[PDB]
Amino acid sequence: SQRMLSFSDALLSIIATVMILPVTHTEISPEQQFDRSVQRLLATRIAVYLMTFLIVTVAWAAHTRLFQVVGKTDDTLALLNLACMMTITFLPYTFSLMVTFPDVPLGIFLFCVCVIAIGVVQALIVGYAFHFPHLLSPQIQRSAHRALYRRHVLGIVLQGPALCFAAAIFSLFFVPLSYLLMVTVILLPYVSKVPLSKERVEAFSDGVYAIVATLLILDICEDNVPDPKDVKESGSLVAALSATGPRFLAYFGSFATVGLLWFAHHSLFLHVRKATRAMGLLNTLSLAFVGGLPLAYQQTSAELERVRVSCTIIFLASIFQLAMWTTALLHQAETLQPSVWFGGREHVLMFAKLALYPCASLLAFASTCLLSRFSVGIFHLMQIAVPCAFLLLRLLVGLALA
Amino acid sequence: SQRMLSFSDALLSIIATVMILPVTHTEISPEQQFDRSVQRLLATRIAVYLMTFLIVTVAWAAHTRLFQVVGKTDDTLALLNLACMMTITFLPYTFSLMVTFPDVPLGIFLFCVCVIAIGVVQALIVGYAFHFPHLLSPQIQRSAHRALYRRHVLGIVLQGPALCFAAAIFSLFFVPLSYLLMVTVILLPYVSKVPLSKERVEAFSDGVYAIVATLLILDICEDNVPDPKDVKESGSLVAALSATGPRFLAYFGSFATVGLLWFAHHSLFLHVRKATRAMGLLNTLSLAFVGGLPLAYQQTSAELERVRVSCTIIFLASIFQLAMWTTALLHQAETLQPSVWFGGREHVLMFAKLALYPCASLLAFASTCLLSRFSVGIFHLMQIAVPCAFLLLRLLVGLALA
């Protein structure tokens, strides 16, 4: 009854991070003196990646908050969910098209056709579930009630499509400066009225963590096996493979950092027992910057000015984890488990495990106070070595406190 | 205690299907009359993909059968598992290197260094788990015993590395026709002595199904957004986007087919209660040919030979599912649930859901009995429309039987 949700969010973790491929494919070499245009293009690609990740995560959150009101699942509901996934799978393409063609009303029209297509399919899921209530609706509250939940959830899931249908109409028939109707489509489930399931947020996070950990090997084994034409450029497979060493070091560093960030994330969500709304909001941003991370590593491993950026990206990807962990100040009894509360058993351990990476990012950004620029390799080695001999490093200080 | 396994197999589903990217990136157009070399190159890339998928699935099965004897998990065990995953993540690269350089002993040496690296890390996992048996060894089978399981599992997990260490030594010091030692490394856990967990096989299958369903959109939104230089080639975003229509039809078909295959797979594994060994062996081959499928669809959507090849690929990807479903003849009481046994409640339904695709592949291969070879678009439309109404279509026949 929940394997289709696991497939859904394993697929949406791919659709969200589909846009970090142009960021990590873009002409890292400055070989030709056109660096200003390449920097502007990389900025555009990073902005498009962040916005596409955000809108696909909004669509994923809407999809899972919809399937949080249909407990069971038919075969027809699985087919309808496949159709819904196939419709939201086009959000990155149509959004990139809308971004590269801002004035052309066809870009906006394709984007809103895409989103009303994932709205209509989710309205059909509700119109098929509330038509068979005695089996599919979750429990005794959404199945046995006044059943105006029908109208409420129909509005909640069908306002987005109807809201940017006005934008698709305002594009061509009127002046298309109304880009804000789509922004309100995105922002209404957040500010209109004024939580995600831990399993679904865990599955989405694991999907987008595996994706961006293997991002730098998806291409290092498809463009980097030296073809047997190195004899033109002696033989020596060894020397022909020692020329892709920079990319191997970049991949090693990227995998180590993303695996350690995922280890911190997994240790935090092993203790979180009920994820609130701010926790998911911060987890989304943590995942966005985690996806950005491989660019930082492949920029470093190719200068103290691009280690600054690499440390900032790690700091962001880790400080959002630390902030969603510290968002327990007044809900440690609701969300956290008693083992990790204030003064709990492994509270210090969890705090240090989550602050290891932002503290290290700050200490490496503090390379501005000396000239030894590449004091980041040693620091990444120390980071990847700490959580091994670090469950004991905390007990030493906890004992020496007295 | 099992989220790290979900991340592990979500990562290994990416590492296994990492090699279907060169298959679907290779110069589909025959624009230059060099089709024989392109066909040989595509055959080499498909063979490398199949062999890499098989060896990465062998490594994944070994990893999960190893973590089937360590029930709990530390933080150190999570770090060691991250190291193990980072070591097996290099199997596709090192295997492609060994394949493109068969005579060079450095390719074989790198491949066996890679596999003894994932063997040593898994021997460290056992040497760390059996050193702390009071907690980490599983729900007590190996926890409370004679504890020669230590030596048994040490041999089972450390024979592969030791077995192809002899191949790495025979490469350079002796004549390197001993490619069979690595074949025995692969084949010993299958024939030496003479089952996988359903959750782990489900997670691996869902990972490699999502990957190859979104495979044709991972690139259609990174190489197909028309840059605003179509003004050289009138304006008309509509006409510039109607030129990537074949690549959209290919993606639509690929996603529909892979989603329907996954729906059949998910309906089968919703009834399977204890996966035997032959079931996993056939699921691996089903997944290999499912990964091959997008090539079939992007070759069709670009003749009665391309459609022949595409129907054969669908037939394979579906007949292996049908064969792992029919592998219940002597174990319907052990594996299947009573609802799907012979004469069960939805036995006919499950049989039809699993034979829909191989029967349709045969009926489309039977295009050889006429000239209208274009009867694959209509057939895929009928395919994707049947499971919507087949639960009632089968009831009609079950009632008319009397």
Side-chain angles (χ1 to χ4, degrees), chain A residues 1-141 143-144 146-192 194-231 233-372 374-393 395-402, chain B residues 1-133 135-141 143-144 146-172 174-192 194-231 233-329 331-372 374-393 395-402:
Chain A
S1 303
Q2 71 206 11
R3 203 229 210 203
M4 56 142 285
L5 285 191
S6 87
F7 173 77
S8 306
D9 59 25
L11 190 138
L12 299 203
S13 43
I14 299 169
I15 285 320
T17 44
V18 83
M19 267 308 156
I20 199 55
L21 269 306
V23 187
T24 70
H25 277 2
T26 187
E27 322 165 59
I28 299 305
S29 306
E31 76 295 338
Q32 58 156 48
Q33 198 60 30
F34 293 73
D35 281 298
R36 196 233 69 94
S37 285
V38 180
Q39 281 193 179
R40 199 263 185 185
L41 184 54
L42 187 42
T44 298
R45 288 188 192 193
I46 290 175
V48 164
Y49 152 71
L50 274 178
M51 284 188 266
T52 288
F53 192 92
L54 288 198
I55 69 184
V56 173
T57 310
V58 161
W60 158 83
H63 183 258
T64 179
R65 265 193 284 272
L66 158 75
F67 272 85
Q68 214 164 337
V69 85
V70 284
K72 281 76 169 291
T73 305
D74 248 342
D75 289 353
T76 309
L77 223 55
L79 269 301
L80 261 305
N81 165 73
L82 257 302
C84 173
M85 297 280 97
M86 189 178 58
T87 43
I88 98 116
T89 209
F90 271 100
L91 280 170
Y93 176 87
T94 48
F95 181 84
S96 287
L97 191 78
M98 184 185 69
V99 153
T100 68
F101 294 92
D103 203 307
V104 184
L106 200 272
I108 325 172
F109 174 83
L110 277 199
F111 182 55
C112 270
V113 151
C114 166
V115 56
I116 78 169
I118 88 190
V120 160
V121 180
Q122 288 176 13
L124 286 188
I125 284 179
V126 170
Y128 178 78
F130 279 85
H131 193 294
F132 299 104
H134 45 283
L135 47 147
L136 294 195
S137 289
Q139 298 185 110
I140 196 58
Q141 72 294 299
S143 50
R146 326 195 189 193
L148 90 170
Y149 280 85
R150 160 103 172 283
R151 227 166 58 228
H152 194 115
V153 75
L154 239 338
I156 287 298
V157 89
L158 206 67
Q159 69 166 38
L163 187 51
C164 96
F165 177 87
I169 289 308
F170 280 13
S171 45
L172 81 172
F173 268 139
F174 290 131
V175 299
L177 85 174
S178 284
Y179 259 78
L180 85 158
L181 272 81
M182 299 179 289
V183 185
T184 72
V185 166
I186 262 62
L187 284 182
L188 267 206
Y190 164 74
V191 64
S192 65
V194 319
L196 293 170
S197 58
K198 206 226 314 179
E199 294 115 11
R200 285 301 304 275
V201 303
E202 260 168 36
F204 187 76
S205 291
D206 292 358
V208 317
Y209 265 104
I211 284 282
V212 315
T214 71
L215 194 70
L216 255 37
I217 200 154
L218 259 278
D219 48 8
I220 215 182
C221 70
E222 99 168 60
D223 296 354
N224 257 32
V225 296
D227 282 278
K229 280 320 203 68
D230 52 17
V231 310
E233 198 174 350
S234 83
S236 85
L237 177 55
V238 49
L241 201 139
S242 176
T244 162
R247 323 194 64 218
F248 279 124
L249 290 176
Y251 172 59
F252 272 139
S254 147
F255 194 97
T257 296
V258 178
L260 269 287
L261 280 178
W262 169 86
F263 173 63
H265 186 278
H266 154 254
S267 288
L268 170 58
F269 270 56
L270 226 59
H271 291 66
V272 155
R273 94 164 96 151
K274 172 187 146 55
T276 165
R277 193 71 158 275
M279 275 190 173
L281 166 61
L282 292 176
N283 183 68
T284 289
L285 299 167
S286 184
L287 271 34
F289 294 106
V290 154
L293 195 37
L295 172 75
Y297 258 95
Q298 80 178 192
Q299 216 96 301
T300 290
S301 288
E303 184 78 280
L304 91 170
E305 195 98 21
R306 39 191 32 170
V307 62
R308 223 83 70 79
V309 161
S310 176
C311 292
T312 301
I313 297 181
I314 302 179
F315 176 82
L316 290 182
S318 322
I319 204 64
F320 279 112
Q321 223 150 269
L322 179 53
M324 86 180 172
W325 142 256
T326 208
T327 311
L329 27 273
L330 301 184
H331 315 259
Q332 59 159 3
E334 210 78 10
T335 86
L336 295 191
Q337 281 193 357
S339 323
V340 70
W341 282 0
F342 277 101
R345 191 167 75 259
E346 55 243 11
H347 175 253
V348 195
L349 188 64
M350 192 66 46
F351 208 115
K353 187 179 312 177
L354 283 142
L356 191 73
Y357 254 113
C359 167
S361 279
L362 265 197
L363 255 51
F365 211 136
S367 89
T368 178
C369 296
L370 55 66
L371 74 169
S372 280
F374 257 103
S375 158
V376 90
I378 165 66
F379 234 79
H380 294 329
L381 203 145
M382 157 207 168
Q383 297 328 94
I384 67 175
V386 154
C388 271
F390 151 87
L391 205 140
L392 70 89
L393 173 147
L395 273 62
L396 266 281
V397 191
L399 269 283
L401 166 61
Chain B
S1 315
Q2 72 206 9
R3 201 226 211 207
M4 56 142 285
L5 285 191
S6 87
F7 173 77
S8 306
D9 59 24
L11 190 138
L12 299 203
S13 43
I14 299 169
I15 285 320
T17 44
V18 82
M19 267 309 155
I20 199 55
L21 269 306
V23 188
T24 70
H25 276 1
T26 187
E27 324 166 59
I28 301 305
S29 309
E31 77 296 338
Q32 57 157 48
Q33 197 59 30
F34 300 74
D35 278 299
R36 220 222 59 74
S37 282
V38 179
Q39 280 192 180
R40 198 263 186 184
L41 183 55
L42 187 42
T44 298
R45 288 188 192 191
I46 290 175
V48 164
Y49 152 71
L50 274 178
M51 284 188 266
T52 288
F53 191 92
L54 288 198
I55 69 184
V56 173
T57 309
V58 161
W60 158 83
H63 183 259
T64 179
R65 266 193 284 272
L66 156 77
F67 272 86
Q68 212 165 337
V69 69
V70 284
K72 281 76 167 292
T73 305
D74 248 339
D75 289 349
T76 312
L77 223 54
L79 269 300
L80 261 304
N81 166 73
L82 257 302
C84 174
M85 298 279 97
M86 190 178 57
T87 43
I88 98 116
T89 209
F90 270 100
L91 279 171
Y93 176 87
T94 48
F95 181 84
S96 287
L97 192 78
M98 184 184 69
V99 153
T100 68
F101 294 92
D103 203 307
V104 184
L106 200 272
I108 325 172
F109 174 83
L110 277 199
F111 182 55
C112 270
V113 151
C114 166
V115 56
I116 78 169
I118 88 191
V120 160
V121 180
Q122 289 176 13
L124 285 188
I125 284 180
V126 170
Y128 178 79
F130 279 84
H131 193 294
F132 299 104
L135 26 149
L136 299 198
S137 281
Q139 299 83 10
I140 70 163
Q141 282 214 30
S143 190
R146 320 192 193 191
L148 91 169
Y149 280 85
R150 162 102 174 283
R151 255 173 83 103
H152 194 115
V153 75
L154 240 337
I156 287 299
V157 89
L158 206 66
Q159 70 166 38
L163 186 51
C164 96
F165 177 87
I169 288 308
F170 280 13
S171 46
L172 82 172
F174 290 131
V175 298
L177 85 173
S178 282
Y179 259 77
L180 86 158
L181 272 82
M182 299 179 290
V183 185
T184 72
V185 166
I186 262 62
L187 284 182
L188 274 203
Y190 164 73
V191 64
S192 68
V194 318
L196 290 178
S197 36
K198 207 226 314 179
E199 295 114 12
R200 285 302 304 275
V201 303
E202 261 168 36
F204 188 76
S205 294
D206 292 358
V208 316
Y209 266 104
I211 284 282
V212 315
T214 71
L215 194 70
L216 255 39
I217 199 153
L218 259 279
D219 38 20
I220 215 185
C221 65
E222 100 172 49
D223 296 354
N224 263 31
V225 294
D227 282 278
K229 279 320 203 68
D230 52 17
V231 310
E233 198 174 350
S234 86
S236 85
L237 177 56
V238 50
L241 201 140
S242 159
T244 163
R247 286 173 52 91
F248 280 116
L249 268 292
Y251 172 58
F252 272 138
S254 149
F255 194 97
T257 296
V258 178
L260 269 288
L261 280 178
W262 170 86
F263 173 63
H265 186 278
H266 155 254
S267 288
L268 170 57
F269 271 56
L270 226 59
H271 291 66
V272 156
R273 108 170 84 164
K274 172 186 146 54
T276 165
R277 193 70 158 275
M279 275 190 173
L281 166 61
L282 292 176
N283 182 67
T284 289
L285 299 167
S286 185
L287 272 33
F289 294 105
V290 154
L293 196 37
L295 172 76
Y297 257 95
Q298 80 177 191
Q299 216 97 285
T300 286
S301 287
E303 200 186 57
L304 85 167
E305 249 129 76
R306 321 211 98 93
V307 63
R308 216 89 68 77
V309 157
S310 173
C311 291
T312 299
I313 297 182
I314 302 178
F315 176 82
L316 289 183
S318 321
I319 204 64
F320 278 112
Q321 230 160 244
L322 179 53
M324 87 180 173
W325 143 256
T326 208
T327 312
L329 28 272
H331 317 261
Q332 59 159 4
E334 209 77 10
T335 87
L336 295 192
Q337 282 192 357
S339 323
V340 71
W341 284 359
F342 279 100
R345 191 168 76 259
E346 57 241 15
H347 176 253
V348 196
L349 201 73
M350 195 65 46
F351 211 114
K353 201 182 322 195
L354 284 142
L356 205 76
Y357 254 113
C359 166
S361 278
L362 265 196
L363 253 52
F365 212 142
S367 89
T368 176
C369 295
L370 55 65
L371 77 154
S372 289
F374 327 126
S375 146
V376 110
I378 150 82
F379 225 83
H380 295 325
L381 217 64
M382 177 211 88
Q383 216 60 18
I384 67 175
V386 156
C388 269
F390 96 117
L391 198 140
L392 72 87
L393 171 145
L395 256 173
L396 264 281
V397 188
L399 268 283
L401 174 47

